[PDB]
Every structure is written in structure tokens, then in C-alpha cells.
RNA sequence: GUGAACCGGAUUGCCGUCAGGAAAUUAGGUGCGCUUAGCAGUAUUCCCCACGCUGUGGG
């Protein structure tokens with residue numbers, strides 16, 4: 173009960189924790205290649221963290237009344253590769269003069285125009301709560317690790333992206349007209 | 355009992371109506387198939403059996 177990582181205040185729109193993961197079917201999706209059922213199988217803490225990190229980069233439209241993320245349709249992502257973590261960090265180090273405030277800090281604000289790097293790289297288009305883990309002896313449906321109490325449900329609300337918001341992704345690829353290249 | 359098990363690309367359709375290969379052509383000029391022979395007057399007729407010191411009977 174306090175500050176949460178990549179989360180916000182609770183709501184009443186209850187959804188099973190499966191829409192954070194694209195490959196596991198949920199709601200109206202057909203469960204043929206992955207036999208799952210909502211509120212029956214859940215994810216562990218590591219998978220919850222890994223699914224909270226997919227919001228800024230891999231969020232698509234929700235149909236009616238729900239928009240996409242900061243990058244609109246998720247485009248190609250091109251970067252540089254190295255044989256170790258330090259090398260990969262050292263080959264894509266280019267900083268900017270304006271950094272902004274990261275999302276894991278205090279309550280993020282859209283505020284005025286311009287974004288920077290830390291704010292843009294951690295844009296949160298949805299509010300999520302991650303209620304609690306429920307005791308049991310099941311296994312995670314994402315990694316398969318035989319574990320203990322998992323989470324099953326959460327609350328998700330939609331945050332619209334204000335008009336304007338001049339942003340250029342360091343890794344995204346754009347077209348001639350400025351649209352995302354997918 | 356394997357990125358594995360459970361797993362249909364499915365339903366509908368005439369290529370029909372039109373057409374002279376036609377007009378004219380000697381395949382012609384030369385060439386012996388020829389030299390030779392009794393189905394008959396004999397001297398062991400290819401095989402087998404029986405009777406004699408040639409006669410019967412079968413192939």
C-alpha cells in the first residue's frame with residue numbers, strides 16, 4: 173500500500189492477467205495452440221514484471237474507445253548487438269541534453285510539449301494494479317516453472333495520448349510521411 | 355509421448371454462333387542363264403524271335 177512500480181490506483185474494470193501477454197489467448201481469443209482459461213491459470217512475479225515492461229513498446233489498439241501507445245502501431249526495432257551486457261550497453265549509450273522524469277519515479281505528468289528520453293522510454297498507456305497472489309501449488313503458464321502462489325486478476329484502465337507530443341524514438345523506424353514502419 | 359498432443363480451404367460456372375489449297379507435267383534409252391546325268395540285270399537289306407546247319411513270323 174504505497175508507491176508501485178509501473179502501476180496506478182485501483183479501479184473496477186476487472187480483467188484476468190493475460191492481456192499483458194500477447195501469445196497467451198484471453199477473452200474472445202481462441203484457445204487452440206495454448207489451452208488456457210481465464211481466472212484458472214496465472215503468472216508468477218517475474219512474468220508480471222516482464223509483462224509490465226511490454227506496455228511502452230508493444231501496446232496496440234483495443235478496438236472501440238481504446239487507443240494505441242506513444243508510438244502508435246508498433247514499428248520495427250533496430251539496435252546494435254554485443255556478446256555481453258556491458259558491451260550492448262556501451263554500443264547504444266547516446267544520451268540527450270533533456271532527460272525528463274522516469275515513470276518509476278513519482279507520479280508521471282504529461283505536462284507541456286516535448287518529452288525527452290526517460291519519460292518517453294517509459295510511457296505508460298494503461299493503469300494496472302496487480303491485486304495480489306493467491307495461495308496454491310500450480311505452475312506458471314508462461315515459463316512453466318513449478319512455483320507457489322500466483323496472481324490471477326488485475327484492473328486495467330486506458331490512458332489516451334494527448335495530441336501533438338513531438339517524440340522521436342531512438343530505435344523505431346519511420347516512413348517518409350512520419351508514420352511508423354511495421 | 356518431441357514449440358509437442360486435439361486439427362478439412364469449403365461451397366457456384368457452355369468458349370456457342372465464320373471459311374474449296376488451286377491452277378501445268380512421257381521416266382524414257384541397251385542385255386542368251388549356258389555347258390551334265392538308267393530309278394535299274396543282281397553278289398550284304400537297318401533290327402528282333404522260333405525251327406535247322408535255308409525255310410516260316412514280326413517291324
Ligand SMILES: [Mg+2]
Nearest residue numbers: 216219312315
Ligand atoms: Mg512465470
